[model samples]
Each structure stands twice: as C-alpha cells, then as structure tokens.
Target chain A: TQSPALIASQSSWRCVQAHDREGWLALMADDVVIEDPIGKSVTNPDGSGIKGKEAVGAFFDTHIAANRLTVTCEETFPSSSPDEIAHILVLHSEFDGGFTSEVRGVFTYRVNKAGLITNMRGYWNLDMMTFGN
Target chain B: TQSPALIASQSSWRCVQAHDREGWLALMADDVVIEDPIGKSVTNPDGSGIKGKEAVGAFFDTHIAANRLTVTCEETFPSSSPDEIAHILVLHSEFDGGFTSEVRGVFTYRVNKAGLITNMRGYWNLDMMTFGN
Candidate 1:
C-alpha cells in the first residue's frame, strides 16, 4: 500500500498534469491562493499571500493547458500540516508544440483534510525563456 | 572554507542561473546532454542522448538569457560520485518582465571533482503554458 502522504501528493500532482480544472479547483480552499512561478500571481508582500483562489483559477485558465502538460517527478519530498498535507515535486515541462522551449519547474501543493488543495506554488527560472518566434 | 562539494554545486548552480555558458560548459565532461522539460530537447533514442554539448550550448545560447533568471532552492539533496558530485535543487523562475507566466522546475547538475559541470538536466511540464498577446 502506498503511504497516505504519497497518495495525497500523487493525487494533487495529477490534478495539475491532467488539467482537471474542476477537479483541481475542488482540491483548493475558497480562500486558497496560488503563488505560481510562471505567470502573474499574488506575490508575497514582504513574504505574505497576495493572490486568492479566483485569481489562481483565472491564472491557470489564461495560461495553462492540461492536455499538453506532462511532468516527470525526478524527486519528491512530503510534509504534513494540520489543515493539509503537502508535496514538493521536482519536475519539467514544455508547450507551443516545441516552438517556445523546454521549462524546468518545482511544483508545491497543499491539500486540506477534506482532500482539497488549499495552496499551490510552482517555481522555475524567469531568465531561461525566449519571447520572440 | 567551504567543502569542495558544496563549492562545486554552488558554482554550477551559478553557471546556469547566470547564463554563464562558457563557465557552465567548462563544468561538463565533454559529453553533456540537457533534457529540458519546457521546450525542444535532445531526446533519448528509446533512451539515449539526442542533443550533445555543442547543441546544448546552442540551446542555451538561443533560449537562456540573464537578468530574469531567479531560482529558489526550496529543497536540495546532494550525492558524490567517483568523478562528479550532483545536486538536485527544486526552484522557480519568471521572465518577460512578468508579461509571461511563471514556471516551476527541477534542476540537476553533475559537477566534476575539478570544479566543472558534466551533465545538467532540467525537468518541468509543457501542458501548463498558455500563449498570450
């Protein structure tokens, strides 16, 4: 049997990879905020939450497509919080049908006791991109 | 004084983050392949190197630039080999003056005992990208 933490993490990982918006959204909290590293996100004002759930969903709908998304979990570290369980997965991805370029990223997810995602943050490099075609 | 492993890992990390190609290249073992997850990459023939160091260098030349690159080492694990030491850093970055989206990634580097990088692979997802005007 898989560990609860591992199962929880894998589930959340699929939520992002599969682009199950409703499913993914269901995993989040009403007050959930996403600190996505790719697009405009609620920033940490001196290191505090800035963006909320509606903003997070809008961010994904505007930026991410689920079908093209795939992630390779090179590594994962799991931890527990009172309200949620978390997973940090080291991964990679691409888009533009290979026109844009390859991207490296870190995906962090927080799933609450009811099995909903309370917070999610993806981390990567802003410098490793090309804007023009 | 820093341990040689720590110093080497830190240096290689700098090489990629700073877009120090020559410095980064100097760290390789003449046989280096980058499996970038975001864009086009040298794939393995059934699982071998598709792009070589020169291509790797070219890949970075065309894609990677300085000024926007920022990496947060949310988690890191290191291991030592006979000829090289490797570090796995989970990081995040953004670019396009924040016009584009943020990306999450996992960066892996193999640094030689002589203080050069031998192999580097960044893993991320392709499905999460959305093209914007």
Candidate 2:
C-alpha cells in the first residue's frame, strides 16, 4: 500500500494539486539543507532546524498557504535502498508569468537507521528550474 | 567484519595504490555503463557487453595497464540500502608530463540483491577531463 517511490512521487503531486504546504513540509528531514545549482543555500536552521511537528508544520503552512501551486513530477527514482536514495525530481509549477516549464533538481536524503530522515541535500540547477514560462 | 563504507573507500584507495587494474575492473558490473557529466559513455559493449571474466580482464589490461593512475575519493556516501551507494571521486592521474588535477562528477551504482553491482552509471565532466595540461 505504500512505496518510497510512490511516497516521494506523490508528495510532489499532492503539493501541487492541493497546495498542501503542511504535507509538503512534513516529509523533509529536520536538518534539511538545499543548494541551488547556482550555489545558493535555502535552509531552515533556526539553531534547532525544523524540529518537532509544530516547527515543520509552520514551514508548510507559510510557504504553501500563501501561494497556489500546480506542479508535476517529471521524473522520480526511488532509492533501491528503500529507506534511502538519491532522487532527481523535475518540477513544473505555477508562476506569475502563467505556468513555468519543468525544472530539474536533485534531492539527496540521508535517513537514519530508524527510517527518520536526518539530512537532505538538494542540488537544484536554476537553469533547469527556470525553464521558459 | 567489513563495513560497506570501508570496503568502498578501501577499494578506491587500493586501485590507486597497487595500480591494481584487475581489481579495479573486477568491481564494475558486467553491464557497467559510465557517463561523464559533460557526457561521454564508457562501457565495454562490444556487442554482448564486456561479458565474462576474460573480456572484463582484457579491458583492464588495455586501459589501466597502459595508463598510470593516481586518484582519490573526494567524497562518498553509503546507501541506506547497504548494497548501493554514490560517490564523488577526484582523480589525479599520471600524464606524459607529470600529474593532472581535474574532475568533478558523480557515480550512481545499483547493486543487485546478491550484493553484486548491477548497474554503475558514471557521470563525468568531459570538459574537466580535457583541461589544458
């Protein structure tokens, strides 16, 4: 009933379909760190990371609650390791210019032996993410 | 008695130290396919792939035997799956002049249920390989 690939893929789908910020943020690790290909850092390191349900929930609410998103997962690869895998996700989401084309990015997740994600490193290429609208 | 991380790291180290062509080629899967980041396919598919031990051995002889290599693993991550992992290896190999320092790429490997690598895709930057000596 549940697949890691499915969970990862569907998460992208749901984030766009329902604009579920809370749900989107729930999946990330506490110490999530993302770097766009252009060498920019996007992280939530308020000294404690996005710890607990409340902190993470707020992240989802703020980002998704404000904006309406309709993005599609262009590609997804489930880590054969089950609990861990490096994923490449291409997202085509809504933008002010109408609809942005697909942008390619990678999510490197390190899950603890207990299945909880500990750190996630994102390598996002703006060239891919900034596809023509 | 051996950690996957230790085995993987030691394997890389051994290849450089012993100049072990046999061991280096042996680690790759029969269908091992490597793509340099900039885009170059390195594989032994003379029809049915570098099939069997003998063919695989020849590949090592022709390539590694001729070239003197000195490389290092800049970074490595063990897959939670225990069998699969990704690595970043920066190589400094002997050239006609001396040594060349270059390389920025990723290796994506998929190991079979039996712990043998099934697919090893290498993403290398051709530009980095062709840097001025």
Candidate 3:
C-alpha cells in the first residue's frame, strides 16, 4: 500500500499542475491551513495565512490557475512521522503578456487521521524569483 | 552503506546532547551556514542569519551548551535528493532558575559529497516559546 502521506502530497501536486480544482480541493481537510513562503514577506502581508479548504482553493484558483505553470516535483521526501512529508518543486511559469520565470521551493504537509491534509507550508524567497528568458 | 546525510545529522544531535563540541563541529563543512529560526521575526535580527562553521559553533557554545536540554528527534525525513534530509525535533529545556518549556520545530540539512553539513535551517516561532513551572 502506498503511504497516505505520499498519496495526499502527490495528489495535491498532480491536481494543481493539471489545474484540477475539484481534485485539489478533495485532498484537503475541512480545517486545513496553508502558508506559502511561511512568513511575513511581501506576499503574506499580515502573515497570519489563509485557513480552511475554501480559502486555500481560492488561492489556487486565483494565483495558480491564472498562470501557465509547468511544475516539476524535483524531489519528494518521506518523513519518519507517519503523516508528514516534504516535496521540492521547480515551477516554470508564464503570465502577463508572456512574461516567464522559474521558482524553486519546498512544500511540506501534515495529514490528519482521516488521510486528509491538515496543514501545508511552502518555503521560498520571493526576492529570488527570476523573470524572463 | 548508511546514508551520509542521516549520519551527519544524527552525529550532530548526539554531540550536542553530549556537549561534545569538537564532535559537533566535525560534522559541519567549513563553509556551513545556519539559520535557527530561518526568518527575521526575532531570533534572527535583520534576518541575514549566521554563516560559516565558526559562527554556528559559537551559537551552540553560548546558547545550546548553557541550557539543560533534552532533544528528541521525533522524525527524520529522507529526501529524493541524495544529500538532503529534514528532522522534526522536540526540545524540552530548562533555563534561568528552574524555568522549563518545550519547543517543537523542523530542522533541515544539506550535506556535501564529503559528508559534511553545508547548510542547516531551523523553522520555529520565537513567540511560541513558553516558560513556566
């Protein structure tokens, strides 16, 4: 049997890359919380983060769906903790008059007893985002 | 063969717990960089973080050595990348006249081909630090 943690994470990534909104939403727990970049930076103004499946899905709809992204899961790490895992992903994206860029980031998740993701945190430096060519 | 990445991390943890300064220092590359909290919130003023083996050793000396700490490696995650791993640790600490608290955080490491740690980043919230009877 596949590890549920891996299943949840891989499913999330596949759903996001495919822009499968309903599929993506199905993987999260009702009270799931997400913090992309994980701290008070330019992207996360107040730094409190978005909570619940609805808000998280909205985030994907607005930012992820609106852009053309080719996401590669460079690595997926299995944790000793039964319900946690981490993934390193590289994204090549194009938006706004054909502007293009790439981003490398780490994404971590904790799954609940029901095999739904409860928390997801992403770590990346916005300042390091490269643009064009 | 044992994974060099896991060996480096486990050895470092053992050395720290034993207060064996030389042993801990031995596991780090000369150019190692460390960020305990990985952000500017409080512990990392200016958020640039400490670089090189010397500074990191100083951190363990001044802070880690001075405190009575029981560190539990709750989880160790192996990445698909050959030289990287992440650990989740819970520290039960005693400092300043019988005060005690527990902090849980994620710690990550990148090992060079030489089997020495090149980078270590810790993720925790300083505000979450608690003290009590």
Per-candidate TM-score against the hidden true structure: 0.39, 0.43, 0.53
True contacts kept of each: 0.00, 0.00, 0.00
Higher-TM-score candidate among 1 and 2? Answer: 2
Off by over 4 Å in 1: A1-5, A38-50, A80-98, A128-133, B1-133
RMSD (Cα, Å) for all candidates, in order, is 17.9, 13.6, 14.0
**Best prediction by TM-score:** 3
lDDT for each residue of candidate 3 in A13-126, tens digit (9 for 90 to 100): 799878899998999999988766555543345565678888887777766777776678876655444467666778777777679977777677878889999987666556
lDDT of 3 by residue, B24-116 (tens): 888999998876655554335556566787887777776577666667898665544446666777777767776897767777787899999
Per-residue alpha-carbon lDDT of candidate 1 for residues A1-133, written as tens digits (9 for 90 to 100): 5434355557655877877777766656677766544233322222233366676666556555531444556555332122222233444344555534444444555555565556655544344333323
Docking class of 2: incorrect
Q: Score the docking of each candidate (DockQ).
A: 0.02, 0.05, 0.04
With a 3 Å backbone cut-off (N, CA, C), the pairs that clash in candidate 2 are: A37-A124, B36-B124, B37-B123, B37-B124
Error of 2 at A57 (Å): 20
Candidate 3: where is the Cα deviation over 4 Å?
Answer: A41-43, B1-133
Q: Residue A107 of candidate 1: its Cα lDDT? A: 52
Cα lDDT, model 2, residue B104: 47
